[PDB]
Design a binder for this molecule. Structure first.
Ligand SMILES: O=C(NCCc1ccc(O)c(O)c1)Nc1ccc(O)c(O)c1
Ligand SMILES: O=C(NCCc1ccc(O)c(O)c1)Nc1ccc(O)c(O)c1
Ligand SMILES: O=C(NCCc1ccc(O)c(O)c1)Nc1ccc(O)c(O)c1
Ligand SMILES: O=C(NCCc1ccc(O)c(O)c1)Nc1ccc(O)c(O)c1
Ligand SMILES: [Ca+2]
Ligand SMILES: [Ca+2]
Ligand SMILES: [Ca+2]
Ligand SMILES: [Ca+2]
Ligand code: NA
Ligand code: NA
Ligand code: NA
Lengths: 388, 399, 392, 394
């Protein structure tokens, strides 16, 4: 049919595609050869590896959402943000997600028929958030009980590829782990339209909680332009911003694939859990922490930043394969993880202090090790000429 | 005994040392006199810092970088080079065709859909503009003055790197600039509906770049943003560490429905007194008024020249150019800034916007922008630092 | 009470000692005033002279140290909020040059709910803004309290701590002055910012300006005032001359007074006259020399006689008139209006290059005081003294 | 025959004037040559300490009039020498009074506000008569006399100075000066009255005080000065680029002495603390009270330190606290006063002196003078008028 003109163009373009593929392969192999000489230096993967999951930022993605919980009205999200422990920041045109008291989301009058978006856009453009400051973020919100879930279909992806195949759709299921130890009965899930931004999960009702935890199970499958699942092939899933304070541990567990250590990172694997195993990582000098997670006077501080060079201090990876992968990410009181005997002691700070049962987390391909070569080009197949 | 070759070397170095030593007092006196003049000028400018067109904090300009019409441009990219054939063809069709048929290259009317075919791709950069068989044509850049640009087609995250050489008039803190390496990257946060961006990178580095995602229709809630990372090099190919250099961020147009801005920049914002341009939330733009038409949206002057006094401020010759300009004080060898255009609704709510009768602030805009980053600071009477403090020559030791 | 019949008798002794001096001062001031009026009757039709010669018994020119108290049925505005509004929108530019440009203030940023205060707060080029400039009196210090009013709403100002002002020789100790937004004003918004200056002779700035000029627009403030003496007793004006000044008329805008007690008094040669119960530039503009029949330019420039719109300008009278007033309670509405609201385009002066239908900002600065702009008007400062009474 | 005698005496007076005309003309031409050479020389030193930035001669010779006679009118109250002396003997003043010192800046004017303090005519007071040998803060051991008035805001006193002996303007002898002092209504002193001590020597200026014994925050006293100079014939003398010395503008950490609302143009002395900003002449950028404090180069009172005592009438570095006003025309004016620093600028903008509160209250008083004693160095004086040849009587 008219297939022969697309064959002509594909054939004219095949040598360029092939040379690009071979050049990138050459560069990747040279980069890995060099990285083998620094694999035990700070910020490097201990086992050198390329990244074939190019998946760092999708700010223009469109989000669709199903749930067996309740959708929340954007009105209700706004109202809850305007009250209780968040109200202060709300009055300074700041959306403080970790201060949101979800008690004001639990009325039945707050429930919507479909997902509605909220964030620092629209009539709140120019506000900033705790997620990306004044960069614009939008999220749909659901209210879940233990065991209930929300399924997010992200489309309109523009920058993400898997071993050179374009990722056109991501279907992600967030489930509230029933073994979570939060004192409340509901969880607010703010699912960002950008899938690389992950989710904010909160059972916070305005007071801190001892021996508490919130854990979200994540099951995801990636799809190409044909709606065909993409089988991961030693893809590197970035698990980053695993903060550990003196009284709180952010961790991942129950995951497919193999933990991948970043050399010099506080994050390691112990008893099937990925977290800061031996030191804190909140403030320099406290509990063996090398750097401060927020920015201040000290050099190397502010590592809990997406663009921070020493981001890797709070990050690790998971080597994954297959089309369906999963991992549970959450926050838990230190006492749930280990006895107080085993804990680092920080002068003036009680390890038994309560913590807010909330967490912001994301799972993407933005691996935090340095000089990780990306696999962006697929080996092209020769075009076939159509039959007349 | 081949200590004769070293002896000839030593003797010619000993004559060059003697000439350098003969010229050192003159160089030192010139440097000290320029320092005296600059300090007196800054002391004088401190008395006008709250008057129209003056820097809020008086400062000298040690980045002499306004004019390089003869520069040579080489270009790398991870996108696709565009043939001059293809650029011409795209200019000859669609929303651009009209002006093309009047022998005018209207860059902001170019529909880049006719640049997205693969037969349009070249293996190396090709130049296009109002020269050759199009000499005498007009462009929206410098009217009929001759301009040339190379073209690339990039997706989000892709980039083009421009090496400008053959520089003739540019200096930084008195060190002559011999090479500029400049990387233009398509910001993935751009909100244009397409997937491609045409970059026209002008051979004159002071002319900046034209970026366009325009496909023939305006777009609501749209934006195009280009990240710029640059390093300047001297005669020896050694990077030049900026020392409070003033990078002019100029012609930041704000219409009723669209804002041109700079953000994510190294250095600190430098205000021009009375300018529409200020800084808010880490972005440099017309924060509180428009600057398109006198009387519309609080703007003091009209950007195009007409009957009204002070109009045509969006020109290079315009004495009130500073009305649409600001600066960035920068230091270090590697500097960066993202410049772009975005629909007003992306920046602030309609509640907060200036109201212009008869014009919808939510109107779509073309996702394109022309911008340039140079040393042509638009404040008035800014003294230039042209002379570098000389080091005494060292005597060579005999062989 | 036995001690007071010695303090009143000691204060009587001094009152009796100065009564001859007070009486001599009164009688010569009377002589000088009568001679001045006799002379002025010979120039009453010369430029800058009152058409009907008259003395000024309202000494009321400058009260920079007066204290201002304020009630309202509108909303008080926080000084913080006023500052914030000045820092934004059409004023921001001048604000960043340490200038408070009152006629450029976009009052939309005063209409938020946090902007309201429980009591009047002062703002101006004082305090942490000392050394700043205003469009009111340039580098001189001015302070004003601010309210946000709807049509028909009002603010009442009590000025005390007056130091230099007198009425029929009687010292003025208190002025009560009510500003009301005329509901017939045609501005496009629903709110008006009132900046009421602590110096009552500086009047008020009224603005409905929202960042855009407006066609067929107007802002009008009703003024009802009563003056009080030391004993807190109202003072009955007796042909007092109220100066209605700086009535600017551009090609598209007319500043005027109307609905006033008393009778208009013309200054000979002034652009200002009375027509259809309104006091304004009746026949010519007064903005630029040669434009619309205007003799002089209101701002200072190249031309002789320019800069008439100044307190110290010798030809200020070109934009001023008077109102002869009597009684204790007087009133007048002052405002600005688009020329199209006053007369058809048929009747308007034609200025090449300028559209008479151009929109204008719905704001105005005005003041009503005793600084009559006619020349050589003798002032009545001395009261005829009453003989003291002896206590018993 | 009765008028042929007058024609003969006019013919001898013409004969005399004609005999003196060549000498007068040669003297004038020689002084013009000397002044032009001096200005040519001064232009090469115009940016050195103590020099006028734009070199100029001084044609207002007006330094010293100790024998001048003063007459005074007012719309306020004349003060008796009785009352001035009594007030000097009491309150914040009394101490210095007991050591035979008249300390004007310590005078509590509260004891001038009673009614038998009032006189029908000006009366003089000072370190003369039974107080000869006393000291004043004006000229210390030199004899000075002043008449005193009590004014409210807007009230004024007009001084006619005659019997002038040493002062000239563009070569014309000054025979009379009429000078009006008005209390600026914008003054912020807490009081309601001002004492004006107007010295018989017009070059000594005036002392203005609203001081009632306590310092005042956010305070100010300002006196408006309007003056016209007259020649032998009673004709006003039209100034022609005369230099009016605006001097002793002291700026402490909490107080600024300044001039404003002036006819003419400000003239800067190179290296002086005094400059012009927003139409006001004062120490614009540094204090000038004590060396090292607030950027001040020298100490205003005399002590050990070199260059100190600059606030002196003879001090060679007088120019450190001085500027000038180039004036023309017959009627000139300027308002001089003292004001709390907070009235001029925010504390943010103020020079910082450790241990000293910039918001401290100050006494609302000031001594100032406006004369021709220009404090820049080597300013050539213009003493000779171009003479006109006499005309012969008929
Ligand atoms: O790395 C992070 N998060 C920084 C930690 C943080 C910052 C501020 C807080 O207020 C806060 O609670 C936590 N964020 C990120 C975002 C998007 C990504 O695509 C991505 O790959 C990583
Ligand atoms: O240097 C320039 N560039 C030309 C701007 C322009 C753009 C598109 C056109 O179509 C056009 O005609 C002109 N003029 C300028 C720059 C910076 C300024 O702040 C400013 O106020 C004026
Ligand atoms: O002296 C005043 N008021 C202040 C002067 C002024 C300052 C800034 C302005 O923007 C402005 O409009 C007016 N009234 C006056 C002056 C001149 C007249 O011809 C007259 O009739 C009244
Ligand atoms: O010499 C004078 N005026 C009299 C000095 C004086 C004033 C008040 C006193 O209380 C006092 O004791 C002495 N004027 C002057 C002096 C020094 C200067 O640097 C300058 O610019 C001007
Ligand atoms: Ca975290
Ligand atoms: Ca532009
Ligand atoms: Ca007016
Ligand atoms: Ca002094
Ligand atoms: Na975040
Ligand atoms: Na251009
Ligand atoms: Na005014």
């Amino acid at each position: 049919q008219a297939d022969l003109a697309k064959y002509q163009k594909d054939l004219a373009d095949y040598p360029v595609k092939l040379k690009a593929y071979e050049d990138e392969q050459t560069s990747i192999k040279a980069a890995l050869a060099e990285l083998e000489k620094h694999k035990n230096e700070d910020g490097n993967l201990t086992e050198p590896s390329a990244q074939n999951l190019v998946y760092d930022l999708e700010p223009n993605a469109n989000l669709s959402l199903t749930t067996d919980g309740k959708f929340l009205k954007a009105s209700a999200v706004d109202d809850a943000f305007s009250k209780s422990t968040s109200k202060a920041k709300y009055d300074q045109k700041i959306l403080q997600l970790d201060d949101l008291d979800i008690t004001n989301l639990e009325q039945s009058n707050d429930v919507a028929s479909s997902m509605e978006l909220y964030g620092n856009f629209g009539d709140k453009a120019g506000w900033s958030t705790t997620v990306s400051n004044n960069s614009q973020v939008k999220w749909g919100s659901v209210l879940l009980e233990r065991g209930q879930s929300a399924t997010a279909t992200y489309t309109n992806l523009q920058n993400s590829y898997c071993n050179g195949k374009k990722i056109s759709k991501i279907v992600y299921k967030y489930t509230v782990d029933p073994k979570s130890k939060f004192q409340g009965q509901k969880v607010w899930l703010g699912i960002f339209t950008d899938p690389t931004l992950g989710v904010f999960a909160s059972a916070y009702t305005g007071q801190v909680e001892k021996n508490t935890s919130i854990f979200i199970k994540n099951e995801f499958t990636f799809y190409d332009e044909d709606g065909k699942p993409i089988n991961f092939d030693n893809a590197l899933l970035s698990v980053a911003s695993l903060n550990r304070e003196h009284n709180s541990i952010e961790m991942a567990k129950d995951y497919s694939g193999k933990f991948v250590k970043i050399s010099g990172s506080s994050i390691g694997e112990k008893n099937g859990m990925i977290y800061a195993t031996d030191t804190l990582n909140f403030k320099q000098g406290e509990g063996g922490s090398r750097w401060t997670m927020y920015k201040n006077s000290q050099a190397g501080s502010g590592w809990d930043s997406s663009d921070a060079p020493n981001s890797w201090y709070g990050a690790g990876a998971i080597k994954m394969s297959g089309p369906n992968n999963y991992v549970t990410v959450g926050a838990t009181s230190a006492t749930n993880v280990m006895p107080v005997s085993d804990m680092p002691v920080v002068p003036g700070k009680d390890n038994t202090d309560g913590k807010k049962p909330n967490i912001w987390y994301s799972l993407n391909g933005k691996i935090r090790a340095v000089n990780v070569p990306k696999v962006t080009k697929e080996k092209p197949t020769p075009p076939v000429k159509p039959t007349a």
